[PDB]
Chain A
Amino acid sequence: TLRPYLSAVRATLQAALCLENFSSQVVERHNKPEVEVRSSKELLLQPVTISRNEKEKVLIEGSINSVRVSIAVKQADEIEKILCHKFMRFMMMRAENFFILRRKPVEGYDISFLITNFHTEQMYKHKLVDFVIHFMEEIDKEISEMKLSVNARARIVAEEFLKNF
């Protein structure tokens, strides 16, 4: 059920990343990501969701010049839950070097993206659609690696101590 989901997510990130520059209609000489300020109802598309199951899903919000993407990551148990939360927080702090990350997640999600017309301008939008998918994949992996890395040391550290008594 993984590839089916990532296929349905990809195609929606395809339709959604069709942006263009757009000067503010509300404010003089201003320019803002419409999906964020929502000050002009007609410029906002229909929010849509693509869910894999009752837990993992994605929210794609589009506007004439910006797309906001919110991923709900898989957290099988407590250990993954905190590892995930510590990993997303970690990247969000670096959102400035990540240029397409939202400093905070949309309430209800684990991570969020803010892709503006400027990004799709200086980055092959198809390659960006690949990133979001590449991303969703890699986080589930890295979380699994961290998980095993914790246990891998919990064992050595528990044997190292008991072997000495």
Chain B
Amino acid sequence: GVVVDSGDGVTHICPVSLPHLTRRLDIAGRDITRYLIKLLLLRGYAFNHSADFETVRMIKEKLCYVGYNIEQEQKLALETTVLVESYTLPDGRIIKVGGERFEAPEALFQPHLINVEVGVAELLFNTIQADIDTRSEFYKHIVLSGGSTMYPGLPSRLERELKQLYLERVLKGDVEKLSKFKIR
């Protein structure tokens, strides 16, 4: 089965192993933390990329998550204050974080957000899409590995993304049903 492994430095996708089909994503742990800092800025919080990295990383690890339907998540942050959570910095001060709890990790699906040139979702699709006798077995045997994969809702997101990609680049109409695959 296929192994998605995103850590601190880089994120991998490994069919099983076979060097030929493997791929790597230039966006992982640090990249997100970094993007988070940039976001907590336009918010009004000034975190030095060098001095506060460790701190912001704890924030990311505690309040960040993967939005299922971004359009849905963006409306939540814009129209209501349910995403807002308070985080206390080492110096005692308290800051609030909301829409950026999901915007930061979004980069994994939208690299351009952090100016990197397809997104782990589309990368996984392709990796497999390109043996036919082994495709079905892969899709139904995707295992996440890595610290940067512990984002609440990440599996659900992959599945929705892959389903969107399966329906467009493999079909066109609705014949999904049998399109079985669990990213447990």
Contact = CB atoms under 8 A, between A and B. Distances in A.
Interface of A: 26-30, 32-33, 36-37, 39, 95-96, 99, 101-104, 114, 116
Contacts of A36: 75-76, 79-80, 82
Contacts of B155: 28
Given A36-B76, A96-B96, A28 B156 contact: yes
Given A37-B76, A103-B79, A30 B84 contact: no
Interface residues of B, number: 18
Contact of B65 (A30, A103, A114, A116): A30
B152 A102 contact: no
Contacts, number: 50
Given A27-B156, A29-B152, A96-B84, A103 B78 contact: yes
A103 B81 contact: yes
Interface string B46-81: 000000000000000000010011001001101111
- Chain A residues touching B, majority SS: loop
Contacts of A32: 76, 82
A104 B79 contact: yes
A165 B30 CA distance: 72
B152 A28 contact: yes
B82 A27 contact: no
Interface of B: 65, 68-69, 72, 75-76, 78-82, 84, 96, 152-156
Contact of A26 (B76, B81, B84, B156): B156
Count chain B CB atoms within 10 A of each CB in A27, A96, A101 and give the residue with the most. A27
Nearest to B86: A96
Given A36-B80, A95-B81, A101-B81, 10 more contacts: A26-B68, A28-B154, A28-B156, A29-B152, A33-B80, A36-B75, A36-B79, A102-B79, A103-B80, A104-B79
Given A37-B72, A96-B84, A30 B152 contact: yes
A75 B34 CA distance: 49
**A-B complex: 7 closest residue pairs judged by Cβ atoms:** A29-B152, A27-B68, A28-B156, A27-B156, A27-B153, A114-B80, A30-B153
A80 B138 CA distance: 64
Q: Which of B80, B82, B84 has the most CB of A within 10 A?
A: B80
**Candidate in B69, B81, B84, B153 with the most chain A CB atoms within 10 angstroms:** B81
Contacts of B68: 26-27, 30
A103 B153 CA distance: 25
B14 to A, nearest CB: 22
A98 to B, nearest CB: 8
A111 to B, nearest CB: 13
Nearest to B152: A29
5 contacts: A36-B80, A36-B82, A37-B72, A101-B81, A114-B80
A99 B84 CA distance: 10
Contacts of A114: 80-82
Contact of A104 (B78, B96, B154): B78
